[PDB]
Amino acid sequence: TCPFYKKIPGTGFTVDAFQYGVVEGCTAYFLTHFHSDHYAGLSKHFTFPVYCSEITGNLLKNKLHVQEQYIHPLPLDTECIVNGVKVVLLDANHCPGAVMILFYLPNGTVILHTGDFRADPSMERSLLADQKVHMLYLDTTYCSPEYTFPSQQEVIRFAINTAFEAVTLNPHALVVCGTYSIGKEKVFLAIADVLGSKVGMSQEKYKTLQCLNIPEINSLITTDMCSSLVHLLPMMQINFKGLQSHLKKCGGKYNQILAFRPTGWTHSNKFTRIADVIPQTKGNISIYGIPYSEHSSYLEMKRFVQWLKPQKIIPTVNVGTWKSRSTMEKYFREWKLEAGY
Ligand code: NI
């Protein structure tokens, strides 16, 4: 049974609700982005209308096999009518294809559903500038003041400088970057660009990247591993055993691995500056964990919400415990008393 925070009142609409069978009353199923917790349930046997971005629709067709007749892609930043209701899709600054959805209800209420997002001041100059929002369905992944991490640009600067220095010292070093979903592609693309290399990967990951409308992608990636000195591997292989086993497969071309694990937040964030990050090392293998986030920090979240001034907030993440729900409600009331709405 579908929970309340995935339903849009006054409509036949649901958001990120594919794991509950046929939802009674649902005439259109929205999908915010192609991450497994959100698409859980979709397959080639789905027969209801799915609304999404172009990039998410390319992934639904090629990777899950959903038939074409049930995929409804919408352009971004454009007023669209769906089943008699005006909607807009906005860039969520999450992974490729990720959107927020503005719903203009027949009774005059306006609802923003963030999906998953990383709030940014540039959102204050989108179509959200133009009118009031009554209800906010909010990605609360990092809604606590301990969740701190740097800008994506600082993190990429660290990764590029780390890789360029290691390979310039040792032209026989290989760089490896872990992945388990779409998102975070700037990590491996920026490193391969500084090294003058294409990125090598499996056929399955190449297929996924070919769905993402990245300009000039054919110049950036390949399935020919031997030609490449930046390789992608599944995240589960990013450990000393997995990486040893990978170096054997390269036929004595390389004598050192430098590997990156993009994570979300980790408690090493509470003490260490990005500058000061050190790897885990065994022998000719070193592994860096780098805090590249595609969700809002506490501070970015609070600024967005204090600017938007919603009448009501419904969290979509951390909703399963009384303590998490209570904690989030306290911060929403602080923010409202501080800013005066
Ligand atoms: Ni996500």
XYZ file of N, CA, C and O in Angstrom, residues 35-182:
592
model
N 16.935 6.303 -10.181
C 17.599 5.629 -9.075
C 16.668 4.494 -8.534
O 15.446 4.682 -8.428
N 17.302 3.345 -8.176
C 16.496 2.112 -7.943
C 15.468 2.217 -6.852
O 14.390 1.647 -7.071
N 15.722 2.886 -5.747
C 14.722 3.042 -4.639
C 13.483 3.775 -5.197
O 12.367 3.571 -4.684
N 13.637 4.625 -6.227
C 12.526 5.420 -6.773
C 11.820 4.733 -7.877
O 10.555 4.872 -7.982
N 12.501 4.013 -8.799
C 11.834 3.257 -9.848
C 11.401 1.803 -9.430
O 10.703 1.206 -10.247
N 11.696 1.409 -8.162
C 11.403 -0.014 -7.680
C 10.012 -0.451 -8.039
O 9.067 0.199 -7.628
N 9.920 -1.470 -8.894
C 8.663 -1.931 -9.479
C 8.475 -1.875 -10.970
O 7.742 -2.702 -11.490
N 8.995 -0.884 -11.697
C 8.898 -0.752 -13.157
C 9.635 -1.877 -13.835
O 10.645 -2.283 -13.271
N 9.183 -2.255 -15.038
C 9.634 -3.406 -15.902
C 8.949 -3.298 -17.301
O 8.030 -2.506 -17.437
N 9.304 -4.142 -18.300
C 8.622 -4.153 -19.693
C 7.095 -4.495 -19.823
O 6.453 -4.278 -20.871
N 6.564 -4.959 -18.691
C 5.146 -5.349 -18.551
C 4.287 -4.255 -17.929
O 3.077 -4.444 -17.756
N 4.894 -3.100 -17.602
C 4.106 -1.924 -17.157
C 3.230 -1.374 -18.285
O 3.674 -1.117 -19.407
N 1.935 -1.149 -17.969
C 0.936 -0.619 -18.936
C 0.192 0.676 -18.535
O -0.875 0.950 -19.115
N 0.723 1.464 -17.575
C 0.144 2.806 -17.261
C 1.086 3.937 -17.726
O 2.278 3.671 -17.984
N 0.554 5.168 -17.907
C 1.357 6.277 -18.428
C 2.381 6.726 -17.353
O 2.074 6.747 -16.117
N 3.632 6.817 -17.846
C 4.770 7.296 -17.000
C 5.190 8.635 -17.561
O 5.502 8.817 -18.705
N 5.242 9.638 -16.647
C 5.711 10.973 -17.009
C 7.122 11.263 -16.340
O 7.268 10.983 -15.148
N 7.968 11.872 -17.176
C 9.422 11.998 -16.788
C 10.163 12.905 -17.690
O 9.652 13.385 -18.670
N 11.479 13.127 -17.417
C 12.329 13.804 -18.329
C 12.711 12.957 -19.604
O 12.544 11.737 -19.547
N 13.295 13.581 -20.590
C 13.785 12.843 -21.784
C 14.821 11.841 -21.321
O 14.828 10.677 -21.809
N 15.836 12.255 -20.557
C 16.875 11.321 -20.157
C 16.373 10.116 -19.372
O 16.747 8.919 -19.616
N 15.472 10.339 -18.375
C 14.845 9.228 -17.661
C 14.082 8.332 -18.666
O 14.194 7.071 -18.500
N 13.397 8.918 -19.642
C 12.654 8.043 -20.599
C 13.666 7.211 -21.392
O 13.280 6.037 -21.709
N 14.799 7.746 -21.828
C 15.823 6.937 -22.593
C 16.213 5.742 -21.733
O 16.404 4.585 -22.234
N 16.432 5.870 -20.415
C 16.828 4.821 -19.524
C 15.711 3.766 -19.334
O 15.996 2.522 -19.197
N 14.449 4.215 -19.167
C 13.294 3.307 -19.011
C 13.155 2.380 -20.252
O 13.002 1.118 -20.030
N 13.295 2.951 -21.420
C 13.216 2.198 -22.723
C 14.400 1.259 -22.863
O 14.143 0.042 -23.064
N 15.652 1.733 -22.706
C 16.850 0.864 -23.035
C 17.281 -0.046 -21.952
O 17.744 -1.176 -22.249
N 17.222 0.347 -20.682
C 17.653 -0.445 -19.549
C 16.579 -1.290 -18.836
O 16.922 -2.417 -18.350
N 15.353 -0.758 -18.643
C 14.262 -1.578 -18.040
C 13.316 -2.212 -19.026
O 12.521 -3.079 -18.574
N 13.373 -1.785 -20.312
C 12.553 -2.199 -21.519
C 11.108 -1.788 -21.655
O 10.343 -2.239 -22.581
N 10.754 -0.830 -20.806
C 9.358 -0.298 -20.789
C 8.964 0.063 -22.197
O 9.767 0.578 -22.937
N 7.746 -0.292 -22.651
C 7.395 0.014 -24.048
C 7.143 1.469 -24.271
O 6.577 2.157 -23.397
N 7.508 1.896 -25.462
C 7.501 3.257 -25.954
C 6.160 3.951 -25.753
O 6.091 5.093 -25.268
N 5.080 3.252 -26.101
C 3.731 3.795 -25.969
C 3.378 4.274 -24.545
O 2.475 5.093 -24.413
N 4.025 3.729 -23.496
C 3.772 4.163 -22.115
C 4.782 5.203 -21.553
O 4.566 5.645 -20.430
N 5.751 5.612 -22.377
C 6.747 6.653 -21.938
C 6.354 8.034 -22.480
O 6.334 8.330 -23.660
N 6.158 8.974 -21.525
C 5.776 10.335 -21.797
C 6.869 11.350 -21.335
O 6.733 11.926 -20.237
N 7.826 11.641 -22.186
C 8.887 12.589 -21.793
C 8.338 14.039 -21.912
O 7.586 14.339 -22.859
N 8.670 14.957 -20.959
C 8.384 16.391 -21.012
C 9.650 17.246 -21.005
O 10.626 16.856 -20.262
N 9.683 18.327 -21.746
C 10.811 19.222 -21.718
C 10.857 19.929 -20.377
O 9.816 20.012 -19.716
N 12.032 20.439 -19.996
C 12.110 21.227 -18.782
C 11.679 22.702 -18.949
O 11.655 23.220 -20.100
N 11.359 23.426 -17.869
C 11.119 24.888 -17.849
C 9.962 25.294 -18.766
O 9.955 26.474 -19.235
N 8.969 24.426 -18.871
C 7.871 24.613 -19.911
C 6.530 24.215 -19.301
O 6.371 23.114 -18.782
N 5.525 25.101 -19.349
C 4.203 24.783 -18.875
C 3.523 23.726 -19.760
O 3.489 23.899 -21.019
N 3.114 22.618 -19.162
C 2.555 21.430 -19.877
C 1.239 21.067 -19.222
O 1.068 21.281 -17.999
N 0.224 20.604 -20.002
C -1.020 20.079 -19.377
C -1.063 18.559 -19.410
O -0.880 17.916 -20.501
N -1.201 17.965 -18.252
C -1.293 16.524 -18.097
C -2.628 16.197 -17.450
O -2.879 16.499 -16.253
N -3.462 15.444 -18.214
C -4.780 14.972 -17.692
C -5.539 16.170 -17.077
O -6.010 16.115 -15.945
N -5.541 17.287 -17.806
C -6.177 18.553 -17.358
C -5.604 19.419 -16.223
O -6.266 20.272 -15.639
N -4.337 19.121 -15.852
C -3.655 19.840 -14.778
C -2.312 20.413 -15.294
O -1.540 19.671 -15.941
N -2.058 21.720 -15.098
C -0.763 22.326 -15.455
C 0.371 21.860 -14.511
O 0.266 21.940 -13.306
N 1.415 21.415 -15.152
C 2.693 20.974 -14.505
C 3.898 21.559 -15.171
O 3.892 21.939 -16.380
N 4.999 21.734 -14.390
C 6.315 22.152 -14.886
C 7.407 21.194 -14.303
O 7.343 20.919 -13.079
N 8.369 20.792 -15.114
C 9.580 20.088 -14.655
C 10.750 21.004 -14.558
O 10.982 21.739 -15.500
N 11.467 20.974 -13.451
C 12.646 21.787 -13.191
C 13.898 20.954 -12.924
O 13.761 19.869 -12.328
N 15.083 21.333 -13.346
C 16.301 20.628 -13.022
C 16.511 20.559 -11.500
O 16.405 21.531 -10.767
N 16.712 19.297 -10.988
C 16.931 19.073 -9.540
C 18.355 19.166 -9.083
O 18.647 19.045 -7.890
N 19.334 19.374 -9.991
C 20.769 19.359 -9.594
C 21.077 18.119 -8.749
O 21.806 18.205 -7.724
N 20.634 16.942 -9.230
C 20.900 15.611 -8.607
C 21.706 14.829 -9.655
O 22.860 15.258 -9.877
N 21.228 13.743 -10.187
C 21.910 12.952 -11.283
C 21.349 13.394 -12.630
O 20.334 14.084 -12.707
N 21.903 12.833 -13.738
C 21.363 13.181 -15.044
C 19.881 12.786 -15.225
O 19.484 11.689 -14.766
N 19.066 13.751 -15.799
C 17.677 13.487 -15.956
C 16.746 13.757 -14.757
O 15.495 13.666 -14.861
N 17.330 14.068 -13.566
C 16.546 14.267 -12.307
C 15.802 15.573 -12.344
O 16.377 16.623 -12.691
N 14.543 15.499 -11.949
C 13.651 16.731 -11.923
C 12.945 16.931 -10.584
O 12.734 15.974 -9.830
N 12.560 18.202 -10.363
C 11.500 18.577 -9.388
C 10.231 18.826 -10.232
O 10.342 19.151 -11.443
N 9.056 18.675 -9.601
C 7.768 18.810 -10.310
C 6.906 19.885 -9.572
O 6.687 19.796 -8.321
N 6.506 20.899 -10.366
C 5.532 21.943 -9.879
C 4.171 21.589 -10.353
O 3.988 21.398 -11.563
N 3.188 21.425 -9.447
C 1.814 21.061 -9.794
C 0.916 22.287 -9.429
O 0.886 22.787 -8.289
N 0.085 22.675 -10.451
C -0.833 23.853 -10.266
C -2.286 23.273 -10.137
O -2.877 22.920 -11.140
N -2.783 23.029 -8.906
C -3.980 22.220 -8.715
C -5.222 22.976 -9.177
O -5.195 24.205 -9.121
N -6.281 22.227 -9.608
C -7.481 22.921 -10.046
C -8.092 23.888 -9.010
O -8.561 24.931 -9.400
N -7.945 23.652 -7.712
C -8.469 24.593 -6.697
C -7.593 25.837 -6.415
O -7.913 26.580 -5.523
N -6.418 26.032 -7.056
C -5.561 27.201 -6.801
C -4.334 26.944 -5.889
O -3.536 27.784 -5.639
N -4.253 25.794 -5.330
C -3.066 25.395 -4.506
C -1.894 25.130 -5.512
O -2.125 24.612 -6.614
N -0.667 25.461 -5.083
C 0.554 25.119 -5.870
C 1.437 24.197 -4.910
O 1.691 24.512 -3.753
N 1.887 23.101 -5.511
C 2.696 22.063 -4.790
C 4.050 21.939 -5.545
O 4.029 21.740 -6.762
N 5.171 21.972 -4.783
C 6.509 21.602 -5.322
C 6.920 20.263 -4.699
O 6.996 20.149 -3.481
N 7.247 19.289 -5.570
C 7.842 17.973 -5.131
C 9.311 18.018 -5.576
O 9.568 18.130 -6.806
N 10.267 18.051 -4.644
C 11.688 18.192 -5.013
C 12.295 16.931 -5.673
O 13.477 16.993 -6.129
N 11.649 15.804 -5.565
C 12.337 14.509 -5.823
C 13.544 14.470 -4.919
O 13.543 14.941 -3.791
N 14.661 13.906 -5.432
C 16.001 14.074 -4.811
C 16.650 15.348 -5.431
O 16.578 15.529 -6.677
N 17.260 16.177 -4.620
C 17.857 17.452 -5.104
C 19.065 17.881 -4.311
O 19.184 17.534 -3.114
N 19.927 18.709 -4.902
C 20.934 19.420 -4.197
C 20.657 20.937 -4.362
O 20.911 21.568 -5.449
N 19.992 21.578 -3.370
C 19.599 22.978 -3.464
C 20.728 23.864 -3.837
O 21.854 23.673 -3.374
N 20.371 24.866 -4.660
C 21.359 25.867 -5.130
C 20.696 27.236 -5.256
O 19.571 27.331 -5.645
N 21.512 28.344 -4.969
C 20.947 29.679 -5.154
C 20.402 29.996 -6.580
O 19.460 30.791 -6.710
N 20.934 29.319 -7.623
C 20.384 29.473 -8.955
C 18.908 29.078 -9.086
O 18.197 29.593 -9.960
N 18.405 28.202 -8.195
C 16.968 27.860 -8.163
C 16.047 29.034 -7.771
O 14.856 29.043 -8.113
N 16.646 30.068 -7.150
C 15.909 31.241 -6.753
C 15.608 32.102 -8.029
O 14.755 32.967 -7.913
N 16.183 31.749 -9.200
C 15.893 32.428 -10.504
C 15.329 31.551 -11.576
O 15.428 31.799 -12.808
N 14.708 30.468 -11.139
C 13.957 29.639 -12.047
C 12.511 30.179 -12.105
O 12.190 31.172 -11.395
N 11.609 29.436 -12.741
C 10.138 29.654 -12.622
C 9.587 29.614 -11.192
O 8.471 30.022 -10.940
N 10.324 29.145 -10.170
C 9.834 29.294 -8.804
C 9.755 30.713 -8.299
O 9.078 30.886 -7.260
N 10.437 31.665 -8.933
C 10.443 33.083 -8.463
C 8.975 33.719 -8.515
O 8.526 34.417 -7.581
N 8.227 33.273 -9.505
C 6.967 33.894 -10.018
C 5.658 33.815 -9.247
O 4.724 34.504 -9.628
N 5.552 32.907 -8.269
C 4.319 32.646 -7.499
C 4.632 31.847 -6.238
O 5.653 31.279 -6.117
N 3.652 31.838 -5.357
C 3.677 31.229 -4.052
C 3.499 29.688 -4.129
O 2.695 29.229 -4.914
N 4.150 28.951 -3.213
C 4.007 27.464 -2.975
C 3.343 27.148 -1.651
O 3.921 27.483 -0.602
N 2.266 26.436 -1.663
C 1.502 26.146 -0.452
C 2.180 24.937 0.228
O 2.398 25.016 1.454
N 2.496 23.866 -0.539
C 3.029 22.620 0.000
C 4.338 22.245 -0.686
O 4.392 22.183 -1.964
N 5.274 21.834 0.142
C 6.694 21.411 -0.298
C 6.890 19.942 0.122
O 6.946 19.662 1.332
N 7.092 19.044 -0.847
C 7.434 17.624 -0.557
C 8.966 17.593 -0.670
O 9.505 17.713 -1.804
N 9.710 17.485 0.446
C 11.125 17.852 0.519
C 12.070 16.662 0.704
O 11.877 15.862 1.642
N 13.157 16.605 -0.082
C 14.284 15.654 0.126
C 15.064 16.129 1.312
O 15.846 17.064 1.305
N 14.817 15.411 2.464
C 15.384 15.640 3.781
C 16.566 14.721 4.140
O 16.859 14.519 5.370
N 17.267 14.153 3.109
C 18.320 13.175 3.338
C 19.268 13.653 4.371
O 19.562 12.858 5.386
N 19.771 14.886 4.329
C 20.783 15.469 5.219
C 20.284 16.621 6.151
O 20.958 17.655 6.341
N 19.003 16.424 6.631
C 18.378 17.484 7.450
C 18.829 17.426 8.951
O 17.951 17.125 9.841
N 20.100 17.702 9.191
C 20.673 17.823 10.555
C 21.966 18.569 10.454
O 22.702 18.367 9.462
N 22.314 19.493 11.378
C 23.437 20.343 11.202
C 24.842 19.692 11.142
O 25.818 20.314 10.614
N 24.934 18.450 11.567
C 26.204 17.699 11.455
C 26.550 17.388 10.027
O 27.688 17.029 9.715
N 25.568 17.447 9.112
C 25.859 16.998 7.746
C 26.419 18.170 7.023
O 25.731 19.130 6.432
N 27.761 18.159 6.977
C 28.519 19.145 6.271
C 29.353 18.335 5.184
O 29.757 17.179 5.376
N 29.646 19.013 4.106
C 30.546 18.513 3.013
C 30.890 19.725 2.094
O 30.261 20.758 2.113
N 32.010 19.637 1.316
C 32.360 20.802 0.431
C 31.507 20.936 -0.891
O 30.671 20.027 -1.182
N 31.794 21.974 -1.645
C 31.145 22.165 -2.995
C 31.628 21.034 -3.913
O 32.759 20.479 -3.719
N 30.858 20.708 -4.927
C 31.269 19.702 -5.911
C 32.580 20.191 -6.665
O 33.449 19.362 -6.928
N 32.653 21.440 -6.971
C 33.879 22.061 -7.612
C 35.150 21.885 -6.763
O 36.160 21.428 -7.350
N 35.101 22.088 -5.448
C 36.280 21.771 -4.549
C 36.655 20.305 -4.587
O 37.861 19.926 -4.534
N 35.716 19.391 -4.502
C 35.946 18.008 -4.535
C 36.608 17.583 -5.852
O 37.613 16.768 -5.819
N 36.138 18.101 -6.980
C 36.696 17.749 -8.316
C 38.133 18.334 -8.407
O 39.051 17.627 -8.930
N 38.360 19.511 -7.886
C 39.727 20.101 -7.899
C 40.689 19.125 -7.167
O 41.807 18.793 -7.655
N 40.314 18.601 -6.010
C 41.128 17.647 -5.238
C 41.408 16.384 -6.043
O 42.562 15.833 -6.077
N 40.385 15.818 -6.676
C 40.531 14.585 -7.435
C 41.473 14.757 -8.662
O 42.321 13.849 -8.868
N 41.255 15.801 -9.449
C 42.075 16.109 -10.667
C 43.556 16.261 -10.174
O 44.496 15.606 -10.783
N 43.784 17.029 -9.157
C 45.235 17.372 -8.702
C 45.867 16.084 -8.173
O 47.070 15.744 -8.482
N 45.172 15.248 -7.434
C 45.634 13.963 -6.910
C 46.006 12.999 -8.027
O 47.137 12.412 -8.041
N 45.165 12.814 -9.019
C 45.408 11.920 -10.119
C 46.549 12.440 -11.021
O 47.413 11.569 -11.389
N 46.528 13.709 -11.398
C 47.578 14.293 -12.268
C 48.937 14.123 -11.573
O 49.924 13.636 -12.263
N 49.051 14.414 -10.296
C 50.366 14.313 -9.633
C 50.763 12.853 -9.658
O 52.006 12.545 -9.951
N 49.978 11.841 -9.275
C 50.380 10.457 -9.182
C 50.808 9.888 -10.509
O 51.833 9.106 -10.554
N 50.160 10.244 -11.613
C 50.428 9.589 -12.887
C 51.691 10.298 -13.516
O 52.420 9.696 -14.347
N 51.879 11.562 -13.176
C 53.082 12.331 -13.687
C 54.279 11.745 -12.957
O 55.343 11.606 -13.584
N 54.189 11.436 -11.689
C 55.324 10.788 -10.966
C 55.569 9.383 -11.518
O 56.741 8.942 -11.668
N 54.477 8.601 -11.774
C 54.547 7.218 -12.272
C 53.672 6.984 -13.484
O 52.437 6.651 -13.303
N 54.177 7.150 -14.722
C 53.440 6.911 -15.938
C 52.837 5.518 -16.088
O 51.952 5.317 -16.917
N 53.289 4.579 -15.290
C 52.731 3.206 -15.201
C 51.654 2.960 -14.137
O 51.281 1.797 -13.864
N 51.138 4.032 -13.536
C 49.959 3.915 -12.614
C 48.603 3.932 -13.432
O 48.469 4.547 -14.483
N 47.684 3.122 -12.948
C 46.277 3.043 -13.459
C 45.415 3.776 -12.455
O 45.537 3.568 -11.225
N 44.429 4.546 -12.944
C 43.367 5.106 -12.093
C 42.039 4.333 -12.278
O 41.639 4.032 -13.417
N 41.431 4.020 -11.138
C 40.130 3.271 -11.073
C 39.125 4.107 -10.281
O 39.441 4.661 -9.243
N 37.880 4.246 -10.805
C 36.773 4.983 -10.112
C 35.552 4.037 -9.974
O 35.096 3.462 -10.978
N 35.033 3.910 -8.765
C 33.844 3.066 -8.458
C 32.511 3.743 -8.874
O 32.377 4.956 -8.724
N 31.538 2.938 -9.256
C 30.173 3.420 -9.629
C 29.146 2.327 -9.265
O 29.457 1.139 -9.460
N 27.927 2.686 -8.898
C 26.823 1.667 -8.768
C 25.420 2.130 -9.206
O 24.385 1.421 -8.997
N 25.371 3.300 -9.792
C 24.148 3.942 -10.195
C 24.583 5.089 -11.151
O 25.804 5.418 -11.227
N 23.660 5.715 -11.859
C 23.941 7.011 -12.493
C 24.114 8.111 -11.434
O 23.699 7.988 -10.235
